[PDB]
Homo-oligomer: A and B are copies of this chain.
Amino acid sequence: VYTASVTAPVNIATLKYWGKRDTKLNLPTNSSISVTLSQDDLRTLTSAATAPEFERDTLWLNGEPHSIDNERTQNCLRDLRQLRKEMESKDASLPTLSQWKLHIVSENNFPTAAGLASSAAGFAALVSAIAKLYQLPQSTSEISRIARKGSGSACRSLFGGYVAWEMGKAEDGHDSMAVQIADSSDWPQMKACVLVVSDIKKDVSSTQGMQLTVATSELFKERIEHVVPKRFEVMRKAIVEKDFATFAKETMMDSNSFHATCLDSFPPIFYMNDTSKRIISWCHTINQFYGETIVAYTFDAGPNAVLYYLAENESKLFAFIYKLFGSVPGWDKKFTTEQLEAFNHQFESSNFTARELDLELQKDVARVILTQVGSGPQETNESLIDAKTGL
């Protein structure tokens, strides 16, 4: 009974992936860049086990088989098994892992309401657990291609730090893979604050939504042909140079560009709501107050706001943010009562007069998720499977 467990992180895109040019190979219309979030805060734990003939690939909450609990993945698994076969077919001293069925047990701690690509994360973790179990030799980038075909943006979750999903120029997509722009150590100070907005209406899924934008948004043409390719270079540069001002401006403009193409689809696609829009308003108010860009917002396919900032400006940012959402839960995790009061005091003792605090905004915000840039998939000794049987 061979086993392997891993923890994988979620990532929030700053240069958005939205639209596929090939739905079979999961090839995108443009490249995307994302920031990997710490697994000390958010993570998926996936244990994979395989042994002499217990049978037929299974999942577990204690039950369910493998086919449509995906079903596009069995193909990716066979891809992995084939790579493992390539191996043993070069050494009879190695077990026939590739011929045995898999036992998979996964779980995460992602707060329900939050967005967080739970599927992308799940697929990356699954692909990592398996790549470990089979002790595959190929690079993470080559392996990411399998995560891509499996569930697209999951490919970016195989790296820590700042990750790019290069769109690729080939029809077979051997060059559409994830590549690391810089690891978390090349820019440790990046922090993130997720504001979970009470999504009081059901939004269009990313899957259907993006296909509708590809098929109907005329402005979308300009986004993939001119806007993204250009922003990709500017953002990658901003990152290698640790230039927050540029990183932030490009991140806010691309969030708005993505939603703009949503609005330009037909029927129009709305993800942000009046709360989302008020949060954006305050961000600009906050940067204007300090005379410099200390915060950057970005929105995915929903109303939740992700605010990126540098650790050094945390107190300057939270003087507003905590004053605006001091009642929402999620703060007492990273801050003590005293630290939080320090925030209140900094606001109270500031010469801020530009606008009045909105005490209502807080009622449409359910949670605050504080975290920061982090590393990639991490093998662990923790496990959800009995090394003896297979839980």
Residues of A at the B interface (CB closer than 8 Å) are 218-219, 221-223, 226-227, 249, 252-253, 256-257, 259-261, 263-264, 266-268, 270, 273-274, 277, 280, 284
Q: Which interface residue of A223, A253, A263 has the most chain B CB atoms within 10 A? A: A263
Find chain B residues with CB under 8 A from A221 CB. 222, 226
Could you list some 21 contacts between A and B, CB below 8 A? Answer: A218-B222, A218-B257, A219-B219, A219-B222, A219-B223, A219-B227, A219-B257, A219-B261, A219-B264, A221-B226, A253-B266, A256-B263, A256-B264, A257-B264, A260-B260, A260-B264, A267-B280, A267-B284, A270-B277, A273-B274, A274-B274
Q: Which residue of B lies closest to A285 (CB)?
A: B267
Chain B residue, CB-CB nearest to A253: B266
What are the 4 A-B residue pairs with the smallest beta carbon separation, nearest first? A222-B222, A260-B264, A219-B219, A260-B263
Main secondary structure of the interface of A (DSSP, over half): helix
Given A222-B221, A260-B219, are A252 and B266 neighbors across the interface (CB < 8 Å)? yes
Task: Report whether B256 and A266 are in contact in the complex, using a CB–CB cutoff of 8 Å.
Answer: yes
A277 to chain B, nearest CB (A): 5
Docked complex Cα distance between A275 and B281 (Å)? 19
Contacts of A257 in B (CB 8 A): 218-219, 264
Q: Within the assembled complex, what's the spacing in Å between the Cα atoms of A263 and B264?
A: 10
Checking B223, B264, B266, B280 against A268 with a beta-carbon cut-off of 8 angstroms, the contacting residue is: B280
Query: How long is the Cα–Cα vector from A221 to B221 in the complex, in angstroms?
Result: 11
Chain B residues, Cβ within 8 Å of A277: 270
